[PDB]
Amino acid sequence: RNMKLDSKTASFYTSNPSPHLNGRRAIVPCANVLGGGSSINFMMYTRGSASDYDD
Amino acid sequence: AIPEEFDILVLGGGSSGSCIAGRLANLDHSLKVGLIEAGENNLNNPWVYLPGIYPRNMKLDSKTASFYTSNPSPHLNGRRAIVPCANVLGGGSSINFMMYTRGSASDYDDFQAEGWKTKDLLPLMKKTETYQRACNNPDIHGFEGPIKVSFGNYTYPVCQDFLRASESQGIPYVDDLEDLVTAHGAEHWLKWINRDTGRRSDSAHAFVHSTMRNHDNLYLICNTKVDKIIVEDGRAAAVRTVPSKPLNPKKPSHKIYRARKQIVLSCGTISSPLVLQRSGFGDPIKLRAAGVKPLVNLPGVGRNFQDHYCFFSPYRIKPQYESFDDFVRGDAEIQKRVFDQWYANGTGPLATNGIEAGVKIRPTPEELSQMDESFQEGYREYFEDKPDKPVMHYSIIAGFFGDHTKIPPGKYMTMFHFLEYPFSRGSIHITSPDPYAAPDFDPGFMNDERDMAPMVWAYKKSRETARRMDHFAGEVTSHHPLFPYSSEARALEMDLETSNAYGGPLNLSAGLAHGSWTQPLKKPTAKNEGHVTSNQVELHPDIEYDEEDDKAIENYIREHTETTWHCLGTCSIGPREGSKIVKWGGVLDHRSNVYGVKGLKVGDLSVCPDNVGCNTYTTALLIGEKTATLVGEDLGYSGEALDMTVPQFKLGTYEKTGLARF
Amino acid sequence: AIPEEFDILVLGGGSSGSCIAGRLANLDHSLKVGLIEAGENNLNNPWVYLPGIYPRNMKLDSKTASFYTSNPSPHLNGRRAIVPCANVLGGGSSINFMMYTRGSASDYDDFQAEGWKTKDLLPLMKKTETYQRACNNPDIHGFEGPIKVSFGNYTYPVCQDFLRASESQGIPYVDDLEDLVTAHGAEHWLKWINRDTGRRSDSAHAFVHSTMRNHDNLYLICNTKVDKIIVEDGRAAAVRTVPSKPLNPKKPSHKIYRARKQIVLSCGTISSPLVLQRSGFGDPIKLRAAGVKPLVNLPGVGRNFQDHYCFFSPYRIKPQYESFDDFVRGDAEIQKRVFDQWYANGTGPLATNGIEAGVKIRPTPEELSQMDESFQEGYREYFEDKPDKPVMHYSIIAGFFGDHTKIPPGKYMTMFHFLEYPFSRGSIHITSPDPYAAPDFDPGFMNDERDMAPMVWAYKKSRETARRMDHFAGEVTSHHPLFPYSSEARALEMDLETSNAYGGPLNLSAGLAHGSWTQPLKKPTAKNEGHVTSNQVELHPDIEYDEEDDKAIENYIREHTETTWHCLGTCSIGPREGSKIVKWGGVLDHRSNVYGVKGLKVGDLSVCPDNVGCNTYTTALLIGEKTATLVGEDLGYSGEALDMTVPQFKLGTYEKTGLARF
Amino acid sequence: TSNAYGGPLNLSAGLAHGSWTQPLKKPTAKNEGHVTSNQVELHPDIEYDEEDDKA
């Protein structure tokens, strides 16, 4: 529910149109509640490769 | 109780065959007419006589249809269209959508038969139906025929909108589009529904079951598929039959009925050529492939198959508006009220065919100029010459005629379009001696280049008239042509607040959009102030097309057209030597006698050389009464009492007698 | 199917226009009468023929009404009253509350036309309705007319109480208040409901749709708003029309119908003067403002507009008593039974108009003495002279006619009062050439000082008769005049225990009162012992008023009166030069011909010079048959068969034939 | 909103007779070009005179 367009808890920034997306203008939603996206997220857990932080 | 030797056999339970059977039994009484049908009896069958459950009859697992499957074709993008056929007594009259309409006067003139002219057939068309509608042109519509025609006992409010929308597109509103002399028009479409009862008006109850109660001399042999027509000494004196379903593999059964003076094929345009071909009527070369011995040389059997090309384009409707979509969905609580009102009263949503209004069309040359040059070339020869003929038709259905399991939940209004006179010509042929074996055949949809332009143009037209309706909420994009994603011609979905209106208070996903599956529709331009409140309108922007947006509509039509069951041709009138209208040569004589044999006649809707720009049911009744009259004179019976009235308790207009209205 | 040139055009689908259309088509059959209407067709429309869903038709978003809005006026305290007009075929007969009543005999005498006298119109009034009621005065009511009138198939118990309450106020109970010769009275109010079926008795089904089934020579052109009446060589030979809704902005459309011998305006009293003015009939000075060229000088068009001034005052009813308030609320479970009984039987709450009883009134001089001196001065000239005329009317509605979203939940009985002959006179005028443009007009409510006293006095009267009813539980104070808070004249609410009776067992706030929003009502005086149990009564104290309690009622009436849709005037009979009854001058001749032109007639209810103290529907039918007869003689047709019976299957009284009762 | 409270089946939602109450005007349209979370739609400010103070 947190992801609905009329939803209060998100900002839904909209991108400039691009040919690469076939003229599509993808929205780029951002959290808008205290605790940020931790209050909104899908709660997936995972951890990155050790090479990443080395990068 | 059943004898072996009937006086006049009438193969088939088709609407035309029920016409011939009922009318024929009536003329002499003494004469013994036996009717043979490959399907179940339908007397007092709830699923037949009550109109509002028509879509069910078309289910794939449905008993009442045969669903023949075509050979694959490149023109349909490798698609293998099924071509369903009726399988119940009364034929397609027990199954049909109950649309009423009548063809152009030029059509019957196009048969160019020694008879069969419109001037001659007008009284016969007049004899076969009563006309419950408030007729203005009473010099054409019959007023006391066995079969009843009306607006039904319920009316979805969609029709007024469709008329106000169509009227703004330069399409005139004509009170009667069945006048036989019109191209452009709009009308509140008529239905084959008995308004006085709310029952379906199929030919079986009107002709066959009404005669059998009254007269002893009629025999109904349901559940016996025809195999072959035995012929000897030049006369067709027998017809061996097999059971419709082979339930006893070890000991197959058959029976040979005998006809003393006449035989008649009313098996429909698909089954009939097959039955002639199993008897050996066809090319010896084509027939040796199935091993049948060729008795008579009739190349034209099975050839010149013809259809109409319907295709459906649903548009979502606003939540506040009525639709039958939730009855056929189907809910256990809505459906209960919908029946309960019909038993209690006779007037409900159940007592109406779904379709509510429609528009025959003949394009303006200005808009015709942008059509592909091939179709312009076809238009000059075919329609330029004749003014009467519409090029294409579409109506509107107050619901979604299709599989509701596969479409998002909501209420929809679906446009229905079928080409009036497709140029393309198909064929059909038996592959095996066995009755049960499926024929290989090519319907030949879109076989000719010229058939595409009107289709695309009617989609472009119907979308615009569905965008001007008050009901409109947004296209259902999954069932519309696959336009490029950025296109302004694209099929937009319903608004966000309407998404909440369908989703309910408790939904956790209404306007949530991820993956950009669908584009929300923009709000309508604001109503003008200073206009009368009744005249104010709020309207969506007109859309415009380019080549890449046309190719999409084209692929859509190629991948989603199907038969409209207005199939006809195969066995058809013409010279045995051949003619321009029938290149392979005809098989019937103008008196409907099959060529090369004595005593065999065809009562099928197949008889027509060329398309009738109307729904085919009326021509079925008409051809059935033509062949009936022909059998009558063939028996030498006098023109006095040659007319063959069925028993019926005629009901007058309610103001003429108090016992006839809803 | 529709021709361009009708023999007798009849613009408008109003109840009067349906009268003229049906009657006219009938006289010759051969004659071609075409009717043009700006609205949807209404044949077999459930929302029209069944009576009990009348309030819905009045919703602001409702399709079937136009809702014209007036210029602001100081007299209404800056209020801008809407003035709704019917927008469906059959006009307001498809929308009305179905109240039946008939005007005083003095009224038709007041037209002082060369014809149009009551003595002459009595047979014509007699020809237009059958009278389902148990008539006592059979020398006046018709008994076999097309339109049926009755008490309906259901009766709320409110009426007996209203009669026993009214009878105690010195108001006599008269069996027939439609006698045409009465002032004081009370009656179980009649309704325009076909008792034999429970359907609404609109003029459209009775005249138009009953003729069209039977006769070919009638054309219905629904959904075409009139623009203008073309006139040349002194004859009105054409009427260009535009679509009712402008759905195609880039290419506006129009069509010009032709009338060979006659034309007729039955567009209602609002639309008609507009249609004449667009044609150039009016003051050149007023018309140059809209740029229309003045063809004929008719100052009186648009002038002398007249209404009635209804205003509603709800009173709460006890929980144990029946009301339609919970059906229109509307519950999904009550409403289901209310329909189910109607389909199953035909007799239910749905089969009745809401209003149940009512009282015409002419004040006693003793109580007249306290009325404002201006109204006394008006009474002497206007009513002193004539005994027949009531000054004001009110009835009772067994529910709340209004927005239930905005009122507390419960069951209510609402008093309805409308002034019989308002002194005030309005006007109307087109501002633009465009058909769609909203006219500027002043209904002129309360424009004259004299119109206030009867209003206040009837509120004071109706409150007292609602306080003596057995049903009474307490005024709903939010919808009653804003008396000073400490006043003994104040509108009290329901008792505490009744508050618990409506709140349910589980409510957490029944008698809780904070902020003193409302005052609880005191208990009724105890029933006398020693009286027969049936004669015992318990009664609330009489209330009394002072100047500050009168100013409140006055402001209430100023801020809450509205049109009762008994609008008439505008184009009206009188000398072209002018008359005392029509100061600006009349436009019609006594033969209903419009002045200065040949071949144009008006069939609208607008024709009346002055108010008829009755609901306007009957005068609509009557004027429609007057103009019908006038067209008949104008065509030179013989007085033999000049009467124009519509087809109908007459039903007798049930004791005369077994096929007619509920 | 009157229809939203009245339910689908109501026979009297926007019906107004006697002018008991005045419908509220629609809020000014949300500005485009603001972040979706910062957009606001707002009713006009009201103003008073002596006769509106006595009430």
Ligand SMILES: Cc1cc2nc3c(=O)[nH]c(=O)nc-3n(C[C@H](O)[C@H](O)[C@H](O)COP(=O)(O)OP(=O)(O)OC[C@H]3O[C@@H](n4cnc5c(N)ncnc54)[C@H](O)[C@@H]3O)c2cc1C
């Ligand atoms: C789903 C559906 C919807 C339609 N809707 C409409 C509509 O709304 N309006 C309209 O005008 N048209 C409509 N039609 C088309 C119309 O009903 C047909 O054109 C018409 O019924 C043709 O009648 P017929 O007599 O030629 O063939 P049929 O009605 O099919 O008669 C053929 C009969 O012969 C039987 N038969 C076939 N083979 C054999 C055999 N070997 N032995 C014995 N019996 C055999 C079949 O079982 C069938 O009963 C619709 C058709 C379908 C099927």
Ligand SMILES: Cc1cc2nc3c(=O)[nH]c(=O)nc-3n(C[C@H](O)[C@H](O)[C@H](O)COP(=O)(O)OP(=O)(O)OC[C@H]3O[C@@H](n4cnc5c(N)ncnc54)[C@H](O)[C@@H]3O)c2cc1C
């Ligand atoms: C809500 C309602 C409740 C009422 N209840 C009662 C009642 O209970 N009892 C009673 O006696 N009276 C009642 N009436 C009043 C009564 O119905 C009217 O007085 C009567 O119908 C007047 O009829 P008419 O023929 O003058 O006008 P209408 O009935 O309005 O006829 C006018 C017709 O012309 C059409 N029209 C207007 N302009 C044009 C144009 N430019 N072009 C084409 N067509 C146009 C309109 O659409 C309409 O159909 C009620 C009215 C309203 C509307």
Ligand SMILES: [Mg+2]
């Ligand atoms: Mg983030």
Ligand SMILES: [Mg+2]
């Ligand atoms: Mg078929």
Ligand SMILES: [Mg+2]
């Ligand atoms: Mg009116």
